Amino acid sequence: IDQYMTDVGRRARRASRSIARASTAAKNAALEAVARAIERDAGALKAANARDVARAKDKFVDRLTLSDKALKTMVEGLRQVATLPDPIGEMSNLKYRPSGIQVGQMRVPLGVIGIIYESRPNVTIDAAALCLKSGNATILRGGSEALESNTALAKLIGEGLAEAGLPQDTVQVVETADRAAVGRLITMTEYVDVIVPRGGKSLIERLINEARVPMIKHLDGICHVYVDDRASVTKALTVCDCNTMETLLVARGIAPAVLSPLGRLYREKGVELRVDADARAVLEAAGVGPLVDATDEDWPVLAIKIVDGIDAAIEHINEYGSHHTDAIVTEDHDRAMRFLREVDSASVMVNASTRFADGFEFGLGAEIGISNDKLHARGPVGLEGLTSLKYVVLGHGEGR
């Protein structure tokens, strides 16, 4: 089994040369072909998925189901990626140096992307589409609980690859169900350049401890909205109504004015409120309840904490948060800009809902995942996250 994965790795590396070379038109043609194939086998796909969904119930299961609406979404997603600009081969900043050479960078694919996913058989299409368009070979590793759906989709990918003239190995499915496959895959550093997990925190914690191949991922997010004492209450109500706020931080000076309509609005929608001692007093005096005591671990449910002001807010966020998405509500210009600069999170917001931190809202036109890491790709990740910049030199015979 350690020779099978090695073989998969070798074939990926070799396939990666072909897809790297493939023109914009060929890649888009592959994608459109996979799209039409799905429109064609809608029934067989709906049928196969049902077999999977039935054995599922017979022992999340939502995210496993391919409704007519999910297929439509996968197809529409294929055509979106086709519509996206082809980022490969682009040259930038080709400047002359005193020495005579001209130096710039080229955007090229990473090469080989490993996708490890649980349920979510749509990942089979959505992940591979993005990798393919960005010129990479893809290694797919789904979960047992979706064998037939993934197998069926992976064959349609191959059909699209065949239609475009591309090698079948442009997309490989790890066919086994053997446990040690993932262990080998996340350690296959010669042949795999990055892993994109699409599972729960349980799997993501395993990979974090074990993987030697770099990953694009976020350990599930604790996100904050800090309501400053120079907040507009009106903005705070609109704004505060993986990137969903889990903790509301409110400056002491404005808590009564803000927490009264906020807590009341949240209560009416059925949200449980976990509050620190100060917030409890503010909410009780406003007649808003019931309320649950917040523990230190707390840092359909919302945690609420009172802070002295912006210094304590930034410090709490950088210390306890997941560095995913965090927002400030304030009318004070310097405090707004300070927050943007100092809050060390993947996306930082002034007077806007934390829900806006996703690839489509941000204009990336896609989202392979969301990264809370500092290096390479951070925040919502689009096509570019699956590419690299190398230096290219237009010379004229210069020696050194």
Binders of a copy of itself among residues 247 to 306 (CB under 8 A) are none
Q: Does 50 bind a copy of itself (CB under 8 A)?
A: no
User: How big is the CA angle at 170 (ends 169 and 175), to the nearest 5 degrees?
Assistant: 50
Own/partner long-range contacts of 51-58 (Cβ < 8 Å, ≥24 apart): 51/148, 52/121, 52/145, 52/146, 52/147, 52/148, 52/149, 55/145, 56/145
Residue 331 binds a copy of itself (CB under 8 A): yes
Q: Cα Rg for the chain, rounded, in angstroms? A: 24
SS3 category, 204: helix
How many chain residues touch a copy of itself (CB under 8 A)?
88
Which residues contact residue 234 at a Cβ distance below 8 angstroms, ignoring those fewer than 6 apart?
none
Which stretch, 23-31, 55-63, 198-206, 287-295, contacts a copy of itself (CB under 8 A)? Answer: 23-31
Any contact of residue 332 with a copy of itself (CB under 8 A)? yes
Q: Between residues 272 and 344, which has the closer beta carbon with respect to a copy of itself?
A: 344
Q: Which of the residues 140 through 179 are near a copy of itself (CB under 8 A)?
A: none
Q: Is 132 an interacting residue with respect to a copy of itself (CB under 8 A)?
A: no
Give SS3 for 250.
strand
334 in contact with a copy of itself (CB under 8 A): yes
96 lines the binding site for a copy of itself (CB under 8 A): yes
Determine, following the binding rule CB under 8 A, whether residue 345 of this chain makes contact with a copy of itself.
Answer: yes
Q: Taking CB under 8 A as the rule, does residue 103 contact a copy of itself?
A: yes
**CB nearer a copy of itself, residue 71 or residue 110:** 110
* Binding residue (CB under 8 A) for a copy of itself from 39, 47, 99, 162: 99
The identity of residue 131, as a single letter, is: C
Does 69 contact a copy of itself by CB under 8 A?
no
The two three-digit tokens of residue 239, written as one number: 């704004």
Residues 351-380 that bind a copy of itself (CB under 8 A): 351-353, 355-357, 361-363, 374-376, 378-380
Contacting residue, 163, 175, 278, 342, with a copy of itself by CB under 8 A? 342
Task: From 106-114, 120-128, 154-162, 171-179, give the range in contact with a copy of itself by CB under 8 A.
Answer: 106-114
Largest CA distance in the chain: 80
Q: Least separation, in Å, of the C-beta of 257 and a copy of itself? A: 16
Minimum gap (Å) between residue 206 Cβ and a copy of itself: 14
Q: Which run of H or of E encompasses 227?
A: strand 223-227
- What is the residue type of 132? L
Scanning residues 191 to 230, which ones bind a copy of itself (CB under 8 A)? 193-194, 209, 212, 214
Residue matched to tokens 């190398």: 390
Q: How far is the CB of 167 from a copy of itself (least distance, A)?
A: 15
Min dist. Cβ of residue 341 to a copy of itself (A): 6
**90 in contact with a copy of itself (CB under 8 A):** yes
**Rounded to whole angstroms, what are the CA distances from 240 to 76, 152, 379?**
31, 42, 20
Query: Nearest distance from residue 357's CB to a copy of itself, in Å?
Result: 7
CB of 395 to a copy of itself, least distance (A): 3
Does position 110 bind a copy of itself by CB under 8 A?
yes
Bridge partners of 383?
A: none
Question: Can you tell me the distance from the alpha carbon of 32 to that of 29, in angstroms, rounded to the nearest whole number?
Answer: 5
346 contacts a copy of itself (rule: CB under 8 A): yes
Residue 157 CB burial class (10 angstroms; 0-12, 13-18, ≥19): buried
232 binds a copy of itself (CB under 8 A): yes
Give the DSSP per-residue string, 33-46.
HHHHHHHHSHHHHH
The three-point CA angle 390-80-363 to 5° equals 65
Length of the chain: 400
